[PDB]
Amino acid sequence: TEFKAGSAKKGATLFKTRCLQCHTFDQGGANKVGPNLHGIFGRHSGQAEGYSYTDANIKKNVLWDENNMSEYLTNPKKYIPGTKMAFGGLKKEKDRNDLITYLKKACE
């Protein structure tokens, strides 16, 4: 695990294009198919208020940081087997760096 800073501009459009369909990142943002991601960095998995996670997510108790996030986004079901997140993953590291750069400034 070794993430590098990418384009937030580029990361924000990855977000709109691959994650918005199921999540919000804003404070005061609502849970939708996926939980609201505001303040995810440094939190553990399964703790968004009012959201119904899988036993799988909960139990993994992942601490969310930028390198976890990157391994996570590679192949979600592989990272947390039993997850309901129906996303196949961001194959290219460059894509992942971008998206995690934006999430890092946007979810805070």
What residues form the annotated binding site for heme c? 19, 22-23, 85
Q: Reduce the DSSP state of residue 10 to 3 states and report it.
A: helix
Out of 4, 9, 78, 91, the only residue in the binding site for its own copies (CB under 8 A) is 9
Sign of CA dihedral 14, 69, 38, 100: negative
Q: Are 44 and 70 in contact (CB under 8 A)?
A: no
* Residues of this chain that bind its own copies (CB under 8 A): 7, 9-10, 12-13, 16-17
Residues making contact with ligand HEM (CB under 6 A): 18-19, 21-23, 33-35, 40, 45-46, 48, 53-54, 56-57, 73, 83-87, 90
